[PDB]
Assembly symmetry: C4
Homo-oligomer: 463 residues x 4
């Protein structure tokens, strides 16, 4: 019959080694795979840190080089408030760019024609943007305005080894002023540490932003980096990873196929021998959830590794996507180590406890999600005008979530004690709102989560 | 008889659909109502954020424009300490107001006659207030004083496209100096984003406050906003909300009436058939608590929505009350989603667990409230002189409440280690006070809350 | 016999009202007493806040008036590092004192002869203190030194409606420089708010401290206040409190005596009727622990109230002791409200749960106190040189106690990541030290506290 | 037979005192030993604090004396950004060194020939280090470079009671600039407090670090201290400690030997009388784990104390190792006090509860360590570029560990809300990453730890 077949299936790997003495091949390939993807990620991260620090250190210098009166820590507050401050900040940036070779501590080269589209072959583009028609007159509430954006650009060229000073800003109708230029530098560390060619190109954008027309013009400096090569093992290790995961993917895929076949042969044997019905869940047991994790992580590592090879050779620069693919795959393979612990009864007791408590925990989350959401909306609408932590809905969730886990509680209460939301009614509401939310979720909801787990443990211990 | 009537009543909605096949009308109207009030609140909040940011950004600029030597972050500390500092801060504010057109980055218009009652048609009123008779002489402890407040006001008028410099302050008897004026601006974003007429009027009040007569005169700037129109779907959606909640209110009210009638017919059927007694609680079961929530939230949304329509058209400006009405209603409708989960046994187990634990939790709160209050009073009286967190009773409660939830613990201990309350006895007391309070409430009181919930869960699981 | 007597004793007050119909007199006097001592403390605290704020606001002004280059927030860091900085800071303080009338915003009077013992009738005493013999020579490690302190004082007198500039500091042997003077002011708020005579005298002490001889001389300013009267209900309420607590003390004392007598009559009735033995505990049951609390709090309120009357009339100024006496008494009377809840079975279940868990919790505290202490000593000795939070033993306990309650964890880890304790070995140790301590105490010790309480609850529920 | 022997063995000490009336000698020596090692550590720590504060206070002064424009709190940010700033910072340090006698508040002596190896008999060595061949040209990506480090040093000699101003820095190829010199001072406090000879020598190193070649040159000042003697009970107490621990080591070692012998005599008595098998664990019971702790701590105290004697006499200066040896020994002896509590049944219930829960807790830690590690790697790779808390793997673990214990949660969420990781995809990932991690570990993993302990308690209570 097949009971012998279905007996081998659904058996422990240790037992499987006594019947037919099949060598453990997936088990040893999984342990190899955990080691290579983990080392690959560590190598990726170590080199990515070096690039991040170089880009960040240079951007700090640009702020000190080009932003008038700039000090560390005043990035969100850095702003101009008068017409002359705005003029002085703009002229300082351009003035500092023109003497950059003789003042800067880094070796920055002018990138001819780096001012962007607005530049006519110039290396620095000083643009001001305003509406076609402002005609703003608060004196009699008259607002003849044509929202069409008119860009007025000035071309500045670097000295070989001043029209911009004649800049008039249309303050009443102004939208923003931008300074665009590029600077080329060489990452010296690379030429000594790994003898790697690394010519960075920095696209500096200094924005004097008046889109809010609120009398306050924030000033920020931003950089984009283009890493080229100034005119191995890592690649070999990357191919090794792709092979190890590709081999793992096939064997796991093969095992999954065997389950689907065995499931098919069973659905009819019971529908003939007994004519008995089989539900969709009854067939899930033929599905190995761990193997689903393994192939899912194989796909992420191969797909993530392919993009990483492009990044290493200077062709992709899609760090965000590659890092997420490799990070999530690495998380999955380490999680997959739980499967090995399920082969031991003492460890399986704990893992099984979480498995049987998980449906109750998920159900309780839906029950309390609606209470949580109601508080989020209530707090955002009421406390948003007054509380720095309730400004956006996503910020409200982060605040409330931290509160129920006992973090940042007093500062939340202190913010509402400072000016009281400029209202006794609002201050009184914040008291009921925060006291009831924290009391409910910590003393009752959190206590129920403990009970669900303890109940699951009790049943696993005492079947 | 009526057992058939009372059987339909107290039945699940799913069962109700088999008997008489009554369409679920309240159930579908509740789900519609959850969607419209939630979207209405989100729309209210998104637009309220835009107004709040514009008002806040302008107020920051006014502080930089009018407050001498002002820097961000020094709002609570901003103060003058000498006679010449006070003079320089006052003259700077008035001097900056008179050149505002040619220095400011925003477009601010002078509001003629905006100085308030003290102004005689002037746009800026510089007032100093002092007692009628000061005669303060600490040299021989003589205090001839007439507390009557004498307001001395100076009229300043803006330049068309200096008497204030001749200001003498009666320092010995001074109460405060205030500068009042108004500035009119137009929210440009509105004319481009939603083509909405929005002429703001800012009432700026700069206070040099000496009511404490402590040698330190704090300086603050405050603004009041009057949003008018410079010379739709939102309203249609608001009527839709009022109709949806009004329809929900009637049906829920009707259902509530049916319960009261059925309760009346039962009180006498059992008092005739059996002559048996019925207690007040026995009649509560005819009361649907969920329907009480529904009509309560209907009233809040309609009442809140009516005020919101006034705000949208520039007639009310009662944001605080409207936001609380809409916030609390929205919280209630999302909470009301719990009722739907009670129709499923697996979810009902969790909801029922909290319901049966709730009386024990409430009783334990009263038991521990008196211990908590005793600590609050003890800490305020003893540590109030020395600890920044124990200054007021409401502040003490916020500090202690955060402590028992494991927040801001070390800073509380650090404050008392800095100067030790300038007393070994006080420092020693703070140690016993804080160590005993945290140990008692975390290790015993909090552990009891867990036990009450676990006991409630045990009984629901094992009846 | 006496079983009727011992039956009335050990009965509930409600039952006591049916037998002999004795009016509840202590019960109503306790509720009255809770109300009067709580209101008395609130009145004490409200007025104490006003004095504290006035003293603090004046001290801030003195720092701005007399400390060269002083800014808020730099109190612990304020120091001089060169000989000329020290000279400039000293001369600034004296220079500012001599023009105080014409620059200050408060009304400060010179107190003739206020310079202290060092002053010879002068209002300001500028003292420098140095060793008799310094002869410090690090060039050849020679240290001829006579530790006798020689005080060199200079007398400065205020202008009627400069020898100090000729000051030479013996830097090599210097200990400190102090400036002593007094300033008299009148709390104007008092003469308007409560028409109360309040002439403050401020003893200002500015210390330039070189006792560490470390090249850094910290500078601090301190004030002592002497509140006199410049030339009611509160007192009546204070007598009411003393009477209410004195009446409560007698009745509780009387009840306690009745217990001791009844205990005596029982010890021999059982030693005659049965000749049976009675242990010391068996006689404790005749002791009413609540009455012990009541008389203990009566003594604190009367003793605390007596001192408060002296403070109110300007004769004591012992705020610390009075506040502790009134704070601790008030805590006790609110705690005593628990007794009333023990008369109700539902509430008594919770209170009894904590009572029966309390011995196990106390025993577990002794078990874990020795582990806790071992960590405190280990951390102080090892991490004290490197970590700002491990500088003193009391600071270490505050740090560790906050850690196990989930507070200030990341900053503790961050401090050791900054410079790594300037040692890999020390950094590695800090990792094991902190990870093992937090893991042990949160996951095991804290989990046991929950178990002890849950076990106590289980036995109370299921006897 | 031996059952009488094995009966004395494995008996309580109290019982042991009735059989043969053997005086408790180890028990009284352990209590003595706890007292002496604890007092020894406190004495070590108190004196070590004094040295640490003196070294730290002097280093702060050096920063104010030698670092141009230095202010407290700007140690990590202190940096130069232009060629002239770097020149001014270097010349200021050397200029301030040459006038140190007449400006400093401490008594610092020049150490002739203290400039280090680079110095040719000079007291201050100003060195600049650069590559042999820079030839950096970002204009056409040309990088002819010879990484050989060339040190160019300038000799500066102090005035007896300027070639450095002629310094040209090779900015394009520069690695760092260092200033080395030594200053000798005498700890005056020592000559007055303990009449102790203490001549400190400070090796000051000021580094202008350009190894990153990022346009930003951080500036830091570091000191090394050499404490000699300028030309008792503590030592006697140290010998007392060594004797007490040496005596304890022998007796504990003797007792351990008795167990091994008794184990040997038993292995064969049961293998003859019964011929029964004995497993390795069955023989562990003859091992007294407490005695293992005692001898282990004896070794640490003696070894730690020996090094401390060298430090006290000015010969070792290995504070880190000595402090760890004495700290860990002291922790062990206080932990060993648990053994005494195990002799009492009420206390033993608690200690035994933790002992029987410990294997389950350790197993659960391995189960959750792999999930924890997967999150650590995922977060470091993805959030490392964007989040200040995810920069290194050890930092990630500290962040995640604090999160699950409810600390620093909101700031972690806030950092990702600031710039959103400059990517919606990254921001969305951070939401799933943090919400799932905190929810999983707090609501499930932490709840299981409580269950394991409660289950262990239940079995101890109810065998
Ligand atoms: C195009 C697709 C072709 C795929 C063909 C793959 C065929 C193939 O090799 O499987 C046999 C073993 C796999 O070894 P391995 O995966 O370790 O062992 C298998 C598992 O034990 C599986 O149970 P679970 O995984 O627990 O559900 C069991 O049912 C399989 O069939 P059985 O019990 O009747 O024996 C075993 O063969 O092979 C190797 O040991 C690696 C050799 C390199 C494989 C890659 C060669 C390209
Ligand atoms: C001035 C006051 C007049 C109020 C008159 C209202 C009369 C009216 O319509 O109710 C019937 C249904 C309500 O539909 P709906 O509320 O969904 O259904 C009712 C509920 O099931 C109720 O039980 P619970 O709510 O669970 O306690 C049940 O006892 C009612 O009586 P029954 O079992 O004998 O049938 C049902 O009619 O109506 C509509 O489906 C919407 C039509 C628009 C209603 C607004 C018309 C203006
Ligand atoms: C110098 C010392 C003299 C002290 C003399 C005090 C004598 C005195 O009055 O007690 C009777 C009641 C007290 O009233 P009150 O304390 O409320 O009632 C007593 C308690 O119920 C007590 O039980 P517990 O407290 O529960 O242990 C009970 O054993 C006493 O004796 P009994 O059952 O045989 O009746 C009762 O008299 O009195 C007043 O109702 C206030 C009148 C003002 C008392 C102050 C007068 C100066
Ligand atoms: C070179 C090595 C020589 C080591 C020789 C040491 C021999 C020696 O003294 O032990 C006897 C007692 C120890 O006293 P003490 O350690 O308190 O008592 C022992 C313990 O009770 C031990 O049980 P546990 O520790 O519970 O496992 C027990 O089996 C021993 O043998 P017994 O039951 O047959 O009597 C007892 O003698 O001695 C002193 O009371 C201190 C005198 C100073 C010892 C240092 C002298 C240099
Ligand atoms: Na916390």
């Amino acid at each position: 019959d097949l009971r012998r077949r279905l007996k081998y299936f659904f058996m422990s790997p240790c037992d499987k080694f006594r019947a037919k003495g099949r060598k453990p091949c997936k088990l040893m390939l999984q342990v190899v795979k955990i080691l290579v993807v983990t080392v690959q990620l560590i190598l990726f991260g170590l080199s990515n840190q070096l690039v991040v620090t170089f880009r960040e250190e240079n951007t700090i210098a640009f702020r000190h080089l080009f932003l008038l009166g700039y000090s560390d820590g005043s990035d969100d507050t850095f702003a101009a408030y008068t017409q002359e401050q705005l003029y002085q900040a703009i002229f300082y940036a351009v003035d500092q760019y023109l003497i950059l070779p003789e003042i800067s501590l880094g070796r920055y080269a002018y990138v001819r024609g780096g001012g962007g589209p607005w530049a006519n072959g110039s290396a620095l583009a000083l643009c001001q943007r305003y509406y076609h028609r402002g005609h703003v007159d608060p004196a009699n509430d008259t607002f003849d305005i044509d929202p069409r954006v008119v860009t007025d650009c000035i071309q500045v060229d670097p000295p070989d080894r001043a029209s911009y000073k004649n800049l008039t800003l249309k303050f009443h109708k102004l939208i923003n002023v931008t300074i665009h230029f590029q600077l080329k530098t060489i990452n010296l560390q690379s030429l000594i540490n790994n003898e790697i060619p690394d010519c960075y190109t920095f696209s500096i954008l200094i924005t004097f932003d008046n889109k809010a027309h609120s009398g306050r013009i924030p000033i920020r400096l931003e950089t984009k980096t283009h890493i080229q090569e100034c005119k191995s093992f890592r690649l070999l290790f990357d191919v090794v990873v792709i092979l190890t995961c590709s081999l793992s993917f096939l064997l796991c895929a093969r095992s999954l196929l065997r389950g689907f076949l065995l499931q098919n042969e069973f659905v009819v044997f019971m529908w003939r021998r007994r004519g008995r019905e089989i539900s969709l869940w009854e067939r899930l047991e033929f599905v190995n959830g761990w193997y689903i994790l393994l192939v899912t992580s194989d796909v992420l590592t191969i797909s993530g590794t392919v993009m990483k090879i492009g990044i290493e050779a200077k062709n992709l620069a899609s760090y965000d996507v590659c890092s997420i693919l490799l990070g999530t795959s690495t998380l999955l393979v380490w999680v997959g180590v739980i499967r090995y612990l399920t082969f031991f009864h003492k460890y399986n007791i704990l893992i099984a406890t979480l498995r049987v408590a998980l449906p109750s925990v998920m159900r309780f989350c839906c029950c309390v999600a609606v209470i949580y959401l109601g508080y989020c909306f209530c707090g955002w609408i009421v406390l948003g005008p007054y509380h720095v932590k309730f400004r956006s809905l996503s910020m409200v969730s982060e605040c409330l979530f931290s509160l129920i886990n006992g973090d940042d509680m007093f500062v939340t209460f202190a913010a509402m004690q400072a000016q009281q939301g400029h209202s006794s009614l609002v201050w009184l509401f914040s008291q009921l709102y925060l006291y009831s939310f924290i009391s409910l979720f910590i003393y009752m909801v959190l206590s129920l989560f403990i009970a669900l787990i303890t109940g699951a443990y009790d049943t696993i211990k005492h079947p």
